[PDB]
Ligand binder design. Structure first.
Ligand SMILES: CC(C)(COP(=O)(O)OP(=O)(O)OC[C@H]1O[C@@H](n2cnc3c(N)ncnc32)[C@H](O)[C@H]1OP(=O)(O)O)[C@@H](O)C(=O)NCCC(=O)NCCS
Ligand SMILES: CC(C)(COP(=O)(O)OP(=O)(O)OC[C@H]1O[C@@H](n2cnc3c(N)ncnc32)[C@H](O)[C@H]1OP(=O)(O)O)[C@@H](O)C(=O)NCCC(=O)NCCS
Ligand SMILES: NC[C@H]1O[C@H](O[C@H]2[C@H](O[C@@H]3O[C@H](CO)[C@@H](O)[C@H]3O)[C@@H](O)[C@H](N)C[C@@H]2N)[C@H](N)[C@@H](O)[C@@H]1O
Ligand SMILES: NC[C@H]1O[C@H](O[C@H]2[C@H](O[C@@H]3O[C@H](CO)[C@@H](O)[C@H]3O)[C@@H](O)[C@H](N)C[C@@H]2N)[C@H](N)[C@@H](O)[C@@H]1O
Ligand code: NI
Lengths: 147, 145
């Protein structure tokens, strides 16, 4: 059956939020709401929803980052902020298409590089990033200190 | 041992220290990076001097995008720090980071962050000793568009 990757607009907010809560549980509910609104008005944020037969089966959040991005040599960079495909629809090339949409968006925005990150423990994610043409650049430990 | 924010006069020596921190970075880029830092409001480097000679530096930025482990924005980010071996373990880095931290606070950052290689044992101890807590460990990927 035919699938479409739609850049998220107001009409897909509920499809998006319903999936996003499955990728990041306990990311606060109020946060999804605000995030959705922020994204709809941004020029450096965009999200994409995989739709087929009227249902949303997956999504990707993306951004255009001007901060230094680990492993990249140019700026700005289009960055894959999160991606999720429902269990029942995996290994069908849904993420491949969502990522192509993110790449197309960042390319049209003038980015020369697309980047992403994932836990060293997320093994399927690593296989997926590599299967899709990303090469691993570096691994780092992040630190935080309250100001 | 004074710490000063970098200006045009410190570029040549900063570049010499910076090439030792990152030998793989094109010399060509140190040139452009220095100009970029001085032109941008969201960037600042600090130089530690002994008898008028630069012996350490820290590059920093105000980051506005997502930063792993942080929950607020902007974030002051320690982009790199280096102290000549002869001056190590004397609190120079501690001092450089204090200066980065004040700059950040004055820019409204509620969090300061940094990152380092899993292999950089010494760096890890330094971060810990200075009050940073480890947040996440990740692998980065890149695909040329
Ligand atoms: C990671 C994820 C988004 C991939 O979605 P997907 O739609 O199943 O991926 P695709 O079908 O487009 O797969 C692309 C490629 O990755 C590879 N791949 C996908 N799943 C794989 C698996 N489980 N094991 C090994 N390789 C796999 C394949 O090499 C290749 O497709 P093909 O060999 O079947 O021809 C999905 O597993 C998911 O939602 N996981 C949980 C959320 C998550 O971990 N996100 C990652 C970072 S936010
Ligand atoms: C990392 C580096 C900048 C630290 O510089 P420094 O001036 O020697 O550090 P400081 O003296 O200010 O030390 C501050 C804290 O780190 C600790 N520390 C410093 N060097 C240490 C070492 N080699 N092993 C264990 N702990 C160490 C100090 O004991 C502690 O002080 P405290 O008494 O307040 O706890 C320096 O070792 C260096 O330039 N390394 C090479 C470049 C690199 O690794 N950069 C880091 C990532 S960008
Ligand atoms: N590739 C997926 C990435 O997901 C998380 O980071 C995202 C972040 O997720 C937060 O982190 C928790 C999961 O660790 C979620 O609950 C959110 O609050 C999200 O809120 C931002 N809008 C975009 C960030 N990229 C991870 N922090 C990061 O390590 C991981 O690499
Ligand atoms: N705290 C040290 C950090 O240094 C490097 O990242 C810096 C980056 O260094 C590039 O990466 C190579 C070393 O990996 C250098 O040759 C430059 O090209 C520099 O060019 C940017 N101006 C600021 C980045 N923070 C590392 N990429 C990062 O992993 C590391 O944790
Ligand atoms: Ni279609």
């Amino acid at each position: 059956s035919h699938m479409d990757i739609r850049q998220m607009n107001k009409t897909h907010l509920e499809h998006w939020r319903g999936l996003r809560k499955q990728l990041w549980p306990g990311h606060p509910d109020d946060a999804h709401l605000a995030d959705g609104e922020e994204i709809l008005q941004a020029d450096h944020l965009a999200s994409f929803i995989a739709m087929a037969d009227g249902v949303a089966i997956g999504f990707a959040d993306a951004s255009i980052r001007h901060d230094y991005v680990n492993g990249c040599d140019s700026s700005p960079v289009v960055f894959l902020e999160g991606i999720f495909v429902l269990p029942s629809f995996r290994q069908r090339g849904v993420a491949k298409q969502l990522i192509a949409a993110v790449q197309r968006w960042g390319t049209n925005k003038g980015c020369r590089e697309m980047a992403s990150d994932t836990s060293p423990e997320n093994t399927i994610s690593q296989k997926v990033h590599q299967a899709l043409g990303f090469e691993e650049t570096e691994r780092v430990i992040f630190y935080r200190k309250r100001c």
